[PDB]
């Protein structure tokens, strides 16, 4: 009623800045905990904080404690730290400008409706606040001089300072919370976000203008977000928006490159030769005692589909995407400085744990191939087009096991970090992030490397096959090739796993917790107090998973772009929804976090710059050994009489005598095709049967292998030099930002004169 | 007499801090210059400097001006800048230590005899000096509170501040010196360095203990050098000593590697097969219409000598020298911080000039090959063993032309820098250094790249040769190979050009200037004054050539070490003499420079880190395409029946029919050997005459080319990762240095309390 529902004290003039809750159930350890609390409350009273208790609530066995801070305490704690406040001093801000004017005219309807977005040609000064010189800062209003966030930060620092006499080593509220004496501690929200009679506050404004699905095409009011939540939350959203901005130019060139291949697919000689039914090309079986001879005309659709994923445009696109990320890094580096300026921020256990971590990483690498092979075998056995359905089933089966193993890997990393004694609090996080990221990388990217580089390459020749354990034969690729399975894997992963299931789980997880709480608790007419309302929300976890998700997503776009031009387009649609999906959680679901000052994102910059450096070698090897670019180039300039591409499929096929088959390897029935077979054909570079040295490696095997090796040498060096040049050219600091500081310092000289004046 | 020979004023209590000399010959422009001087002297008097003139000297038409500074001017100018002075506050400094104690016991006789080298367990504080708080610093003695160097620095700053009313734009003494009104300006030396009755001063101490040839095995007293000369000179000598220290461990492994090859030269099968006289192997002529057939047994000495320069030890040494420099960089980076802590230092014209510079660089690259070819032709024509003498003559002839072209390149760079307007004084030097370094690099390293990679490789086959301009045939390599000329070139260069002629010219150049001055001037009983004595010395130039010489020397050790194990040993002998050669010049020859504060060497770090990065690719290519390592490895594992090295020379030789020679290419007389010749042999991979496709590239040509290509791919990546790991592991800041600052700051808190106390 007169207390505005728990926001103020009983007298109505003291604002609650923090809330402590203890489990006072209606017993020697309980008495000891009570004595410790009482001593802590006495120390807090000695510090200079007003104290209050409430014991009459509907919830059983809970007590709430209110904390308040006076004016002199706030002044002293603000002067102790380096806190900058606005000053009455005001200065004016001091062809190419008409372009900015035109774009400002055009971009008017998309800007949000907030007070700060109004242009300001004058900016006030800012000087450290201290008790010695109070004339420089206007102290007209005490209430409006301090925001709620900076009011709660000082109280949190005071709570961290306090130590208990009984436990001299134990300091701060963290140890008390860890022991189990207290339950939780949290600041209060400003008010409601919905309601017809609700008065104006920042929560409702951010709900209407920022956290909604109907305003997905607007900008974000970053200043209000930083004012309400803090400087650690704002940098994440700024980085997300900057990352989302740079995908629009990259999502158009990929579409153009993809569309170029659809128009020129009906004039492709290699794909036209395979689909012709005038020849009678019989191929050898692909398995032992079960399969039989087939025909080349049965892979026409796969041959036609493979054309859209390799051509010179797909190499030009790789060269382009090589420089795109180098430009993005410089863009973010230059953007961070403006935000820094505007926000006024200018032994044996260790070795043993490291060895165990390497062992675990090796085992995690090992298990994935076994899981993939088992999934493929199960998918093949379940069925009995066939191939596409079998591949899709195998991928879908493997994804679930990956999802299940992620959590176990995370728990293992957490326990491994815990068993080793951490020196401080920052090193704990800096080590946990690395330990989790390595395991997530090796868990996510293992099956892709196997199909691209290792599947179907070490299998033998007809008549001399390779067996493992003397009883199992190595598997081969698809009849059309192994470039089609990679595209299906990438498409299925990117479209389903990262877009549908992830977001559905994110939305649906809190509902089960709410339902469980409702079932366990078991109407309300009187209005509950603020602390009782805030007690039913979910506590804040952190920002590590939010960064980890986007960092994992960043690797798919760059590492495997040489054979998938549509990768950048799939990420933009997800990033469009992710911003407004994450915005709602902070406003409507979680509890209010405390503010932390930061000047950079932190350790993720090094990870991004390592992935960007790693992408190039993989791109070069994928272009060299997975496609048919180099064989075509070699055939055109060495073996063609015309100078054209006639006879290329004729060139790449060998011959074999079906009468030389090993015992127990011939097909069961050779008359399914309807005619007798005497010679089958396979893909390799070996000698003909009608020769002195049959089935031997020929001279053309060695000529293509040097051409594949030289391409990597040229590509790697050229791309590395081009990537370094871009960093060299662009400066790291904007000119206007650096210019503005010098005049401010020149006037700050007279400000220093004003200090004694 | 009573003035101590010009050191003090006539009264005997004012010390001369600077000296200005004008050309007052015994005429309107002369009157204008006199008026300008007079105005400058009036401005200096307004500044607060005492002035004096002397016009009675033996030298004709010269006048000297004396400058003196009072105490209050010194105090004000010292408080204007950030100058730190010692304080009365004193603190104590706060298994592994016994090793340091033992090495201190052993290294006693090699330490110099100076006061500062005595161990000090207590170190005084240091606080900014200001007029507001003079109680913290003891002002007991005015004379001993300021050194001569810091006394002259303030006067130089005052002179730079002064501006002339008539020329408002012109400021400082630099413009006056450039116009021609004044001749020179220099501070004074402390006194003499030789003499039985000479009193003690720092010049004599540095002469006896530092700048001498009989103390070449001792340390250097860096603190006294910095106290007398400054902080810019000391860093050069510290870097030189640190660079000289790290060559001792590297000069022993090279000797061991070189000695390993001498013991195993009598069991080498490939060199034993060539020296055997049981076979009769006739080779084809190496030139048109003049040479004739020769025998393989005539290159036995060259074959035996080539063994000492390639073996697995020469690859292990390359891998070792890859990490040596990475360790050296970290060593210097960690050493700089201790010196920083101890010394209290904690539009269209531009584009046009750039294009002209690229054109000049291209032309400079072009001219060197022509010069080398002309020198080789002249050396061959002059004579008429023959080969060794001809090669030595060609190298000696080329070196002189290189020496002559260096100065023209330097002058071109200077003019090119001058024609473009520089923005400031630092950018001028930073651009001139780069412009000179690029031209010196391309001038020095051009002939080495040509012999290693391009000579004798694009020449044709017997019966189908390659001609340029339809009349000139391409040259071939030496009969034994092209690995012997590179060693002779490197040895001759390193031993003669950098060690004998350079030092002789450095010593002998000032003597010609002294003799010319003596001849032009034309005895003395009275003692000359200090300014008249200092007027006859040579002015100081700078530190760019001193750094450039050592930077150029640094490239020979690292870039071309894969085939010359004795390179690090030749540089140590030169660096031993260079220190004591350069020390004498500063003490006995040049004028006294003014002090400049610096915290790093500057732009040379980037050049060193670029050369270190560049060395790896060149090393890999030199190992792959210049030696015979890969062919031997290919022969051993693919073509040998034994499993040994029997029949390798048999493998690498082809055959040719002497009856298929082109018209005008057969030798004049084929009967010099004493018997008829029907088949000659050459080195290549081609088909035999008794085949369907004669003189065609065979299958063994393509098998070795892939093996040469894979080695580079493996080597480059492995060495790059290993080089990055070393930087990753080692921290960049010493632990004790960082630890010491925190306690000093903790006590500086009480020092701040002492400020008001
Ligand atoms: C593609 C890269 O090149 C190689 C590089 C390095 C080593 C081997 C390489 O080559 C791959 C071998 N894979 C053969 C070329 C394909 C093939 C196709 C059909 C077959 O018939 C069923 C058989 S098989 N098992 O009968 O030989 C083999
Ligand atoms: C050594 C690297 O390999 C090559 C790599 C790339 C291209 C060509 C390469 O090979 C070099 C060719 N140089 C031949 C192999 C040497 C030779 C020796 C004696 C001769 O007789 C006088 C002749 S010649 N002019 O008569 O052919 C040639
Ligand atoms: C070629 O294949 C067709 C496919 O039906 C078959 O009818 C025909 O008999 C075959 N001819 C030969 C010569 O194999
Ligand atoms: C290509 O070769 C075929 C057969 O050798 C011939 O019919 C055709 O005309 C040739 N095409 C061109 C463009 O030379
Ligand atoms: C395939 O190549 C062989 C080898 O020259 C040739 O004889 C055969 O006719 C070719 N096949 C076709 C269908 O052209
Ligand atoms: C290989 O095939 C030919 C027919 O092409 C046949 O005559 C010969 O007998 C076969 N080889 C063997 C070993 O049977
Ligand atoms: C082999 O060379 C020696 C060298 O003098 C010569 O005397 C001898 O006649 C030669 N023999 C043959 C067969 O060429
Ligand atoms: C090497 O081969 C030669 C001739 O083939 C033979 O005399 C010799 O014994 C072999 N050496 C070994 C170690 O096998
Ligand atoms: C060199 O190789 C050929 C080819 O096999 C062989 O006939 C000849 O005997 C060899 N020469 C010697 C001296 O062994
Ligand atoms: C090549 O040499 C053989 C002897 O080795 C000779 O009989 C033949 O005539 C020669 N070739 C020609 C074109 O003369
Ligand atoms: C009143 C709201 C009308 C618009 C609703 C839009 C819902 C979200 C659609 C987002 C689509 C973005 C491209 C995939
Ligand atoms: C800073 C917030 C940006 C939010 C994204 C706005 C929507 C962009 C849609 C662009 C469509 C391009 C299709 C190729
Ligand atoms: C018998 C020939 C079959 C050819 C198949 C070609 C497949 C093209 C699919 C295009 C899908 C585009 C979706 C955006
Ligand atoms: C943004 C820079 C793009 C540069 C693209 C260079 C690659 C061109 C490849 C051409 C292949 C031609 C095959 C016949
Ligand atoms: C607002 C501007 C930010 C920086 C934009 C840089 C260029 C964007 C286009 C991508 C270029 C890629 C070249 C390979
Ligand atoms: C961060 C601002 C970026 C401005 C555009 C930069 C585009 C790329 C310039 C360098 C191109 C290098 C081509 C080899
Ligand atoms: C040839 C049989 C063994 C294959 C081992 C390699 C499988 C894939 C390894 C992937 C390494 C990178 C994982 C992130
Ligand atoms: C990870 C590398 C594994 C190497 C396995 C070697 C197997 C050799 C048998 C296959 C040789 C013939 C290939 C067609
Ligand atoms: C009759 C042929 C059917 C082929 C179906 C292929 C399915 C591939 C789906 C790839 C994208 C899936 C996104 C959820
Ligand atoms: C008034 C408009 C409401 C639109 C609601 C959209 C909800 C989207 C939930 C996320 C779906 C993730 C898988 C596509
Ligand atoms: C086996 C490859 C693992 C991933 C390599 C690329 C990631 C680089 C991460 C850099 C970590 C830096 C921590 C300070
Ligand atoms: C920390 C930022 C740079 C990290 C770069 C890591 C790249 C590792 C690639 C290794 C390639 C060579 C393996 C032998
Ligand atoms: C640096 C990445 C691109 C390099 C492309 C090299 C191959 C170009 C085609 C082959 C040469 C064609 C000559 C007409
Ligand atoms: C009185 C001086 C005795 C020693 C004279 C030494 C002269 C210089 C010799 C330096 C040799 C260093 C190794 C090349
Ligand atoms: C810091 C000054 C060092 C001066 C060098 C001292 C002489 C070193 C001689 C070492 C001889 C080693 C022979 C292989
Ligand atoms: C006929 C055989 C001649 C062999 C010549 C070997 C030359 C060895 C020279 C060693 C010089 C070492 C100087 C340090
Ligand atoms: C300091 C690290 C040295 C490592 C040396 C590795 C190179 C070994 C080469 C062995 C060649 C063997 C040829 C048969
Ligand atoms: C005083 C110590 C300075 C640093 C010494 C570092 C090791 C010196 C030996 C060279 C090691 C090279 C390994 C390839
Ligand atoms: C600057 C102090 C150097 C101390 C010795 C360092 C020796 C090299 C250590 C790293 C070795 C890496 C081997 C792969
Ligand atoms: C084949 C004829 C032309 C040879 C041109 C190359 C000669 C050497 C070039 C050296 C480049 C590096 C100079 C510092
Ligand atoms: C700098 C590269 C120059 C290339 C010149 C090509 C000359 C071709 C004639 C030689 C071919 C046969 C070599 C034995
Ligand atoms: C009789 C054979 C004489 C051979 C003389 C070779 C001279 C090579 C000298 C290399 C070093 C020169 C240093 C000045
Ligand atoms: C008392 C000892 C005197 C020694 C004098 C040495 C003079 C050396 C001059 C430099 C010679 C450079 C070529 C070897
Ligand atoms: C043609 C090669 C010239 C030399 C390349 C290596 C030297 C690198 C110098 C880096 C200059 C940095 C200036 C800021
Ligand atoms: C400024 C410090 C790094 C400079 C590195 C320069 C190395 C240049 C090597 C270029 C190799 C590739 C040429 C195509
Ligand atoms: C990384 C630099 C050294 C690499 C050496 C590679 C070749 C080693 C010899 C060849 C293999 C021998 C197997 C027994
Ligand atoms: Ca998500
Ligand atoms: Ca010298």
Coordinates of C-alpha atoms and ligand atoms in Angstrom, one line a residue, chain A residues 315-316 319 623 629-630 633 637 711 714-719 722, ligand 23:
Chain A
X315 CA 37.4 -21.5 -56.5
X316 CA 36.9 -17.7 -56.9
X319 CA 39.5 -16.8 -52.7
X623 CA 40.3 -28.3 -53.6
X629 CA 39.7 -30.0 -61.3
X630 CA 43.4 -31.1 -61.5
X633 CA 43.4 -29.5 -66.3
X637 CA 46.9 -29.6 -71.8
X711 CA 48.7 -26.4 -56.3
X714 CA 51.2 -22.0 -54.7
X715 CA 47.8 -21.5 -53.0
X716 CA 48.9 -21.4 -49.4
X717 CA 51.7 -18.9 -49.9
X718 CA 49.7 -16.6 -52.1
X719 CA 46.7 -16.5 -49.8
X722 CA 47.3 -11.5 -49.5
Ligands
LIG23 C1 46.2 -18.4 -56.0 C2 44.9 -19.3 -56.3 C3 44.6 -19.3 -57.8 C4 45.7 -20.0 -58.6 C5 45.2 -20.6 -59.9 C6 46.2 -21.4 -60.6 C7 45.6 -22.2 -61.8 C8 45.1 -21.4 -62.9 C9 44.8 -22.2 -64.1 C10 46.0 -23.0 -64.7 C11 46.8 -22.1 -65.6 C12 46.2 -21.8 -66.9 C13 47.1 -21.1 -67.9 C14 46.3 -20.6 -69.2

